[PDB]
Design a protein around this ligand. Structure first.
Ligand SMILES: [Mg+2]
Ligand SMILES: [Mg+2]
Ligand SMILES: [Mg+2]
Ligand SMILES: [Mg+2]
Ligand SMILES: [Mg+2]
Ligand SMILES: [Mg+2]
Ligand SMILES: [Mg+2]
Ligand SMILES: [Mg+2]
Ligand SMILES: [Mg+2]
Ligand SMILES: [Mg+2]
Ligand SMILES: [Mg+2]
Ligand SMILES: [Mg+2]
Ligand SMILES: [Mg+2]
Ligand SMILES: [Mg+2]
Ligand SMILES: [Mg+2]
Ligand SMILES: [Mg+2]
Ligand SMILES: [Mg+2]
Ligand SMILES: [Mg+2]
Ligand SMILES: [Mg+2]
Ligand SMILES: [Mg+2]
Ligand SMILES: [Mg+2]
Ligand SMILES: [Mg+2]
Ligand SMILES: [Mg+2]
Ligand SMILES: [Mg+2]
Ligand SMILES: [Mg+2]
Ligand SMILES: [Mg+2]
Ligand SMILES: [Mg+2]
Ligand SMILES: [Mg+2]
Ligand SMILES: [Mg+2]
Ligand SMILES: [Mg+2]
Ligand SMILES: [Mg+2]
Ligand SMILES: [Mg+2]
Ligand SMILES: [Mg+2]
Ligand SMILES: [Mg+2]
Ligand SMILES: [Mg+2]
Ligand SMILES: [Mg+2]
Ligand SMILES: [Mg+2]
Ligand SMILES: [Mg+2]
Ligand SMILES: [Mg+2]
Ligand SMILES: [Mg+2]
Ligand SMILES: [Mg+2]
Ligand SMILES: [Mg+2]
Ligand SMILES: [Mg+2]
Ligand SMILES: [Mg+2]
Ligand SMILES: [Mg+2]
Ligand SMILES: [Mg+2]
Ligand SMILES: [Mg+2]
Ligand SMILES: [Mg+2]
Ligand SMILES: [Mg+2]
Ligand SMILES: [Mg+2]
Ligand SMILES: [Mg+2]
Ligand SMILES: [Mg+2]
Ligand SMILES: [Mg+2]
Ligand SMILES: [Mg+2]
Lengths: 77, 46, 62, 102, 93
RNA sequence: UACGGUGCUGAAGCAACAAAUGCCCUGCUUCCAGGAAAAGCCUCUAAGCAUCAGGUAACAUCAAAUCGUACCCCAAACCGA
RNA sequence: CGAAGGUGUGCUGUGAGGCAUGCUGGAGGUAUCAGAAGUGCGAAUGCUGACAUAAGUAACGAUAAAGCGGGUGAAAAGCCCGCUCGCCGGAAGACCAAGGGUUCCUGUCCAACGUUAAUCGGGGCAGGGUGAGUCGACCCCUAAGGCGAGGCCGAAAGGCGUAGUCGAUGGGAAACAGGUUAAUAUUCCUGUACUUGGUGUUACUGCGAAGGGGGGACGGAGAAGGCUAUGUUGGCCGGGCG
RNA sequence: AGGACCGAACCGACUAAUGUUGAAAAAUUAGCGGAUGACUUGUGGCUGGGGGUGAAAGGCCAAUCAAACCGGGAGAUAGCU
RNA sequence: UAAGGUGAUAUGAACCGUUAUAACCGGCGAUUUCCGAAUGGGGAAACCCAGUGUGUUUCGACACACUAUCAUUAACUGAAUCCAUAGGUUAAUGAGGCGAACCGGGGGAACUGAAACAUCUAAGUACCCCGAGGAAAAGAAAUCAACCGAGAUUCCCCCAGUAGCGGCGAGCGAACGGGGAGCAGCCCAGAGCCUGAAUCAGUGUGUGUGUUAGUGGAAGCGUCUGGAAAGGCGCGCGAUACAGGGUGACAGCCCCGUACACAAAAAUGCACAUGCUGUGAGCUCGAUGAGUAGGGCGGGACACGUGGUAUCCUGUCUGAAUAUGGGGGGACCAUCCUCCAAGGCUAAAUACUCCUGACUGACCGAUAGUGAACCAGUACCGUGAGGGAAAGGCGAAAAGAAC
């Protein structure tokens, strides 16, 4: 599913509004990308489906700290 | 003239039978509905 | 009848079962064959069988 | 805890046989009792070819409500009511009048 | 078949029809009402153990019970299993 | 011989011709639109087991369960009230 | 010593209504003043049930066709038996699959069912009746397709799909005549056989797979030739002499 | 040889009559078309509703089709009867 | 507990039992086929077919047990690839499916109304889906207030159809503050001294309490009518019992009961006391939740439709300060007040009733009341989802009509 393993960003629903304010149901999808992340703690590439923000979160927290939060959430990576 | 009902017990068993209903979530609910209404003959079987 | 059967053992109860079961079979024969006025012996013997098995399950080790 | 037993002498309180004394014969499930020579019905018994074959008008005892009878005391010569008390270690019936055990 | 307890439940009753009396007289074949879960091997060992008579071969069929009416109510009789038990030669009972 | 049938015996029981849309034929001939699969079966070995197991043949012996089998079925029994 | 309800009668009130009373009915009813409403039906092509009408009218379902005698019976155009007649005969005959499910057979009954009568029946009731190593299913095998461990995808539901597993309408071992029951029979009996396994014995021995190869294994049309099923005649046997 | 010819089974349905509370909610009777093919048929399977499928008629999708059926929103709304 | 019993239509048969193993009632137990989450594999539900391991055998074959998937943890093992990792096998623990409503969350209509219609409405309704529990959610101020102060959350009544929102239309619709129900506060983000001193959690035991069977339980005769008396008449009696239901017409005193008084071998609930095992207070000083707050873009939610629009949520792009600091006080600034987010737990007052028990009703009384007073979700219809009836009353007693 279109969910980020770091953040848990999933598609959220909303409305498209026109100039006449005609509302129509629509989805907001995250900016999900599969990216291989270097885990130097383990000498291994780990592949995560992640949002661009989760990519920012990994840079900040470090993939080592992040993955410890994932295996503390199930979330087999 | 050929009428609409042309019996086949296999076609009957596969299209509407008990296993056919327990296969899908929505068939599981058909039975749940029939079980709650108290139907004597839950499915076409037998 | 359970009180005296308790004094008996697993053997001496398994044989009583078979004898009861044979008596069951002969009564079943006699019943269908027009004989057997005394219809009550069928329930009589059916319940003694139930009594001996309840005690065997009570002497298995449980 | 029944007041009217199988072989007790009773007197009828309500009916065609008001005042008659009989001995109970059967206590039915219904709360009805058959009493010897009391509620005589004249049946029309059909014949059967097999067993007890003679068709006939039989005068048998019919059943009356247990409410409609009372044990006869036979000391007072009157109807009476029953109570239950425990003597030495057993439940016994006693006559309400005179407090004597049946 | 081997267990005595099982053999004592397998034979239910003898069947007393005209076809069965013919089968006895001519073809040396006793017709029995047996349990619906009685197999040919169980019926053979049962008759040979219980009636003390030699058995050549067992034929079997499942009789479908009859729909009946009891006033307005439908009802069906229970299916039963019929066994034709051909003896070698010898009948006693 | 209970009119519904039963028990014993028992004649000749051959040939020629004709002849299928059936069999030889899962063939032959021809054509283009170029015509299932898988197992049983036969065979070969691998790992592996060998004066064992396993294999072939013969022979004996045993087993082959269970379910269906009634009856209608171009129809009064199925689909059509 | 007769409530409600029902049905008449009498009296009475401007009216909706009320009072009395006979008969039926056979156990509940209720003044008064207040109170509350599922409170008043002739309509709504209203709803349900009941009953009319048309009407003893139309029709009784293929224009294949009946007739008589006897029988049984309360009763016979319809059932049974019989003799004729007529109808089908690549079917209106016979065997099955499917589907139905006891309709099969016997006895018994005729209220309803049968478009009439019914003694008859696929009708009611009761009893009986289905017999398998070889038929068939189950089983081994797979097709389309379906399900689908993990997996991939997807807001959830769930979708697709690998390995696999199911799935016949296809492939895969073997039985024939004859005789028989009221009703079953390649299933029972008689006779004569066949297959696959297992276990043992004997003699000999390289045997072993989730793998390799072969085989299974396949179209349409057309043609000749050789055969049988089957039939026709003749012969033979038996009867017949109209 | 052939989307070849005549013609039965088989598949279809041009005409006419009958029938139209029918024997039948589309048939019967006489005739009619195709009849080795783009044929026909059995068994099973797949496609699902703004969807399918359609040698295309808005045809067909269980006697229902310019949006199926069942249930629900639902006592929709009804300036109309 | 008991003299009567072997469920019903439903008789009959053959029997059991009557002073205590008949039956009946209750508790703990036992047995508990096949299907069905169905779980050994399959499958047209109630069927087909196995595998392994034991123990049996007259060597024909038997009986029992285990064998699903996923998750977690563990052990053994184990690639490409030296390490390793994926992957494999096994064990142990747990889940799976059903179920009325209530609850929370993820998605989300249209008819309709606006007298047309698109914003708006209907409505975050119906519906689908996930998950939970006895309730759930929520919850201990980065809240309100107004310079006075309040002191977590939830529900009720007011505030008020007000302030506002609004094609300023149709319509939507607060809060402040007050009155009440019920209140309860805690923990981590770390150290040390003190150490098991609070606290529920289980998990034993004691004593009380109730539930699951049950015991006793008052007192009436005579006469009249009548098929029958409980009715009439007469004269009596009980009442902590005149609640009710029955009995041949209307019974306080015929019966069952009712008030009242009592009662449990066995199991169990909720309370208490107490004991084993685990969890830690108390002090002292430190520490104070970052891709977060905030912002831009697009959307949603707040009564509030972007409007002058604060505040909350966030899909996307960004991105601080960090107690000398930050958030809020409805654009925004300043000052003043007030609180301290980005980490969590938490009873009660609240919601609901598939089901059980008792009681009630100016509720119905067989075209009503449940669809169903009756063998009804049946018959019947329908491929199926689904639809869905009609049908109560002899009599006091069958005395159910011998002949
Ligand atoms: Mg189908
Ligand atoms: Mg041919
Ligand atoms: Mg047959
Ligand atoms: Mg047949
Ligand atoms: Mg025919
Ligand atoms: Mg009344
Ligand atoms: Mg009157
Ligand atoms: Mg009217
Ligand atoms: Mg009018
Ligand atoms: Mg006329
Ligand atoms: Mg006329
Ligand atoms: Mg006429
Ligand atoms: Mg006719
Ligand atoms: Mg005649
Ligand atoms: Mg019948
Ligand atoms: Mg017949
Ligand atoms: Mg007639
Ligand atoms: Mg007549
Ligand atoms: Mg019949
Ligand atoms: Mg799939
Ligand atoms: Mg999966
Ligand atoms: Mg298979
Ligand atoms: Mg036949
Ligand atoms: Mg051998
Ligand atoms: Mg020939
Ligand atoms: Mg002549
Ligand atoms: Mg042609
Ligand atoms: Mg032509
Ligand atoms: Mg045809
Ligand atoms: Mg025709
Ligand atoms: Mg024609
Ligand atoms: Mg032609
Ligand atoms: Mg057009
Ligand atoms: Mg149609
Ligand atoms: Mg619904
Ligand atoms: Mg309406
Ligand atoms: Mg609505
Ligand atoms: Mg299983
Ligand atoms: Mg399974
Ligand atoms: Mg709208
Ligand atoms: Mg409008
Ligand atoms: Mg809107
Ligand atoms: Mg509010
Ligand atoms: Mg008592
Ligand atoms: Mg009393
Ligand atoms: Mg009485
Ligand atoms: Mg924004
Ligand atoms: Mg803020
Ligand atoms: Mg202050
Ligand atoms: Mg903070
Ligand atoms: Mg009703
Ligand atoms: Mg009435
Ligand atoms: Mg209804
Ligand atoms: Mg109704």
């Amino acid at each position: 599913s279109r969910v980020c393993q770091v953040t848990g960003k999933r598609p959220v629903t909303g409305n498209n509004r026109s100039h006449a304010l005609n509302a129509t149901k629509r989805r907001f999808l995250p900016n999900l990308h599969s990216h291989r992340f270097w885990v130097e703690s383990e000498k291994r590439f780990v592949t995560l489906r992640v949002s661009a923000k989760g990519m920012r979160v990994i840079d900040k927290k470090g993939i080592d700290t992040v993955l410890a939060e994932l295996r503390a959430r199930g979330e087999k990576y | 003239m050929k009428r609409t009902f042309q019996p086949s017990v296999l076609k009957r068993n596969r299209s509407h039978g008990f296993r056919a209903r327990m296969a899908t979530k929505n068939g599981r609910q058909v039975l749940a509905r029939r079980r709650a209404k108290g139907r004597a003959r839950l499915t076409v079987s037998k | 009848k359970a009180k005296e059967l308790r004094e008996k053992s697993v053997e001496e109860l398994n044989t009583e079962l078979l004898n009861l079961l044979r008596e069951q079979f002969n009564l079943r024969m006699q019943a269908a064959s027009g004989q057997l006025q005394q219809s009550h012996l069928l329930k009589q013997v059916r319940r003694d069988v139930a009594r001996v098995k309840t005690l065997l399950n009570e002497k298995a080790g449980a | 805890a029944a007041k009217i037993r199988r072989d007790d002498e009773v007197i009828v309180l309500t009916g065609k046989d008001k005042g008659k004394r009989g001995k109970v014969k059967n206590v039915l499930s219904s709360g009805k009792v058959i009493v010897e020579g009391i509620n005589l019905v004249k049946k029309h018994q059909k014949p059967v070819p097999a067993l007890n074959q003679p068709g006939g008008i039989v005068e048998k005892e019919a059943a009356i409500q247990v409410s409609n009878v009372a044990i006869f005391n036979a000391a007072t010569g009157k109807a009476d009511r029953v109570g239950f008390r425990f003597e030495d270690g057993k439940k016994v019936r006693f006559f309400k009048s005179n407090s004597e055990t049946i | 078949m081997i267990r005595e307890e099982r053999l004592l439940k397998v034979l239910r009753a003898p069947h007393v029809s005209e076809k069965a009396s013919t089968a006895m007289e001519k073809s040396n074949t006793i017709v029995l009402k047996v349990a619906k879960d009685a197999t040919k091997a169980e019926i053979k060992a049962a008759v040979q153990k219980l009636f003390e008579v030699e058995v050549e071969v067992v034929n079997t069929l499942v009789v479908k019970g009859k729909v009946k009416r009891h006033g307005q109510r439908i009802g069906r009789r229970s299916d039963w299993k019929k066994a034709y038990v051909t003896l070698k030669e010898g009948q006693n009972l």
